[model samples]
Target: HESKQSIMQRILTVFVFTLLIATVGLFIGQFVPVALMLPLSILEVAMIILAFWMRRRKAVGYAFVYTFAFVSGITLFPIVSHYASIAGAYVVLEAFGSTFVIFAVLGTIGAKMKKDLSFLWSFLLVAVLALAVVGIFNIFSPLNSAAMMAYSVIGTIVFSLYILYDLNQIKHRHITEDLIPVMALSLYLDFINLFINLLRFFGILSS
Candidate 1:
């Protein structure tokens, strides 16, 4: 059994913050000028740094803020695709949605099933670097379908692994209950990336 407050607290926080990211932030991104893309992208980066600098509760607060920024970032994604085909964006978005399930399922299992996810560190680092490299390249030119697909697919994998690492950190006593915010922050990233990518994939398809 769970504490009613605990269950409500977790669910409500996730809902409010997720709503901010998926709805408010994403909608804002949709119409934001292509001109603001570069400078606003910097704001997104700063949000991540700010989250890391805060303690637990503050981190989660900023984490939610950061999620919104990224959602806005994805809004600018259409600009990147202007030079490419809509179909390519669809593929990238699929990668995002699929990654969400991967993260949720793995986190649940890590919380429920017995496994050590820390062993993923080596691959996670490699994958992150790979993602950063590809992302950098996309800045110069619309990514070809293959590259977008690859990044979406690999980003899902790496981020899902991050979910496992994060979940286990709490499950294994590495972090205290007072730090649920940190865990929430981690899961929020997984959720946001998953949503943005999935939306990106679908937005162009339905268009």
Candidate 2:
């Protein structure tokens, strides 16, 4: 049997590293214009897709993984800096603290559970798709502030559950060591999306 904590340790390491790189990107973006990130954002998406495809390539896979992480940070820089600028740093800090607390608590619970969490896969997909549909619809037919807030509230809940499910995947050892990048990316996305939705929800509430 694998060392149970090994995967969690690996995931956390990648998580911290990615966050640090993203923080650097955020600070850099404060000086740089958000407009510059437009094209880079497209590139970042390509990098993410390519990382999955390169998974069997070993050295190349790792290269793509780290590169994608950094680029993802670069892409987030605009949003991070923008939120902090508009909402005051304190709100952003509060959001971060909230995200961390929720994630850590739920993650710990999931980690201790012996049950499999694979069932969450289907639920998250449908929930995310519903959110996307509404978000796209809002672009053409704008939702009122109240409706938008409701939407963000739903999004926050969905992504929080995702963290719980993903941590359980780690606990169950659904993924092997070679695929740590993929697992980390899944957890990273879950955490970030939850944070973004929470930020929006709190920002709207505070306003």
Candidate 3:
């Protein structure tokens, strides 16, 4: 069995590589015409499915992870563009910074603490489904600013706990070496989603 140090290192390596791919995607999106957004969004979703499906297949899974990361970044352009226009780069920087701090603090707690957080999985399931339903509803009808802010708050809390749980899993050896890519995927998704909502939530604070 690989040690926790090894597992954490692999997770960090994978995350950094994915972040690089996402950065490139964002840079490309800035230059490319907005017309390409739809196609890239579709491609991003497909890549996510592909990555998840192949997650157990070492080499193949890693390839799909790169593809997914790049495509996800591309798909983020529209949102990034909108925010950049309105809030300037500082907002983005703040959100990214906040995301890092939340992850770092929570991850550290999860790693060093002896408690097992696996029990959160059940509550998370219900929370996810509820959030999904509300999110879709909000998409169609605009849940009003307050309602949406509530969503952001709920999301940040839920995903932060998830990060806590997943980190502890890594510390406890629930995730083995062969599954590092899968573990990275899990943490990455949590981080990304948490960042997005934190961005929105912070925006509310400013307003």
Give the per-residue lDDT digits (tens) of candidate 1, residues 1-207.
Answer: 555346435743763465455545545655766676654223323333332333244334545544654564455445335422645555545645465567668766766656766677577666655655555556555565555655556655566666667666556544434455555655665555544444443434444
Name the candidate, 2 or 3, with the larger lDDT value.
3
lDDT of 2 at 168: 84
lDDT score for residue 175 of model 2:
59
Which candidate has the top score in TM-score?
Answer: 3
| Colliding residue pairs in candidate 2 | none
* Cα RMSD (angstroms) for every candidate in the order listed: 5.7, 4.3, 3.7
Evaluated against the true structure, the overall lDDT of model 3 is 0.70
**Regions more than 4 Å wrong, model 2:** 34-60
TM-score per candidate, chains pooled:
0.61, 0.81, 0.84
How far out, in Å, is residue 36 in model 3?
3.4
The per-candidate count of clashes, in order, stands at 2, 0, 0
C-alpha local distance difference test of each model:
0.52, 0.67, 0.70
What would the TM-score be for candidate 2 when compared with the true structure?
0.81
Segments in model 3 whose C-alpha atoms lie over 4 Å from true places: 38-60, 204-207
lDDT of 1 at 108: 67
Ranking the candidates on TM-score from highest down gives 3, 2, 1
C-alpha RMSD of candidate 2: 4.3
lDDT, model 1, position 76: 42
Kindly list the per-residue Cα lDDT of model 2 for residues 13-47, writing each as its tens digit.
88777667666665665666555666422332333
